[PDB]
């Protein structure tokens, strides 16, 4: 069994791909490769704010986020919106799939 074959049936669903950087990607999902390479379409990808007296966020993820070209200048918080991001498989940590779909049909 390869559970990645489950993600292949989640196509055309709203999803968050939460990466190893801590970067979170909300978007509509397209075909997922057998290596779990996940390709999305209309995505708003951001970094959470640890509050904690304004403790410094990931320094690499901010640079990687500004360097997508999708971060707009007037965004107050740290976010970026872009079309067509393709994500390598080993970068994914968690995937939050919608509440509506039923697993009993898709997990077979």
């Amino acid at each position: 069994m390869k559970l990645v074959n489950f993600l292949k049936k989640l196509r055309n669903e709203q999803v968050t791909i939460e990466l190893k950087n801590g970067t979170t990607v909300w978007g509509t999902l397209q075909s997922v490769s057998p290596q779990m390479n996940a390709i999305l379409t209309d995505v708003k990808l951001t970094l959470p704010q640890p509050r904690l007296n304004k403790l410094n966020s990931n320094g690499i993820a901010m640079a990687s986020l500004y360097l997508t070209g999708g971060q707009q200048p007037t965004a107050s918080d740290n976010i970026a919106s872009l079309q067509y991001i393709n994500i390598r498989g080993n970068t994914i940590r968690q995937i939050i799939l919608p509440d509506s779909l039923n697993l009993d049909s898709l997990l077979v």
Partner: protein, 106 residues
């Protein structure tokens, strides 16, 4: 998992009858008994909404101090209130206790 006909015994009222009185526990059962039809998948979303909760080994229901169950059954009623409501097109404010019981009873 049973390939053979057999008599098996269990308990529908696991925790709540043991905590709360007998008149009310069946009423809390029937608030649920309508609900799992209306909770097609949100049942396991709302029953396991508190992940601290475990089901006892002898028992079936999710054992708890029963406050969120009053919240769960109120949430579950609202899913019944809208699904009965949407088919006949009733406003949620127009729903009254005599209608709400008719949703529960009928």
């Amino acid at each position: 998992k049973a390939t053979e006909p057999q008599m098996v015994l269990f308990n529908i009222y696991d925790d709540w009858l043991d905590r709360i009185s007998s008149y009310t526990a069946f009423s809390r059962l029937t608030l649920l008994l309508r609900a799992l039809k209306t909770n097609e998948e949100s049942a396991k979303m709302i029953l396991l909404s508190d992940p601290t909760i475990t089901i006892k080994s002898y028992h079936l229901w999710p054992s708890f101090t029963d406050e969120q169950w009053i919240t769960i059954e109120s949430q579950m009623r609202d899913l019944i209130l809208t699904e009965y409501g949407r088919k006949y097109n009733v406003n949620i404010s127009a729903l009254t206790q005599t209608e709400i019981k008719d949703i529960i009873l009928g």
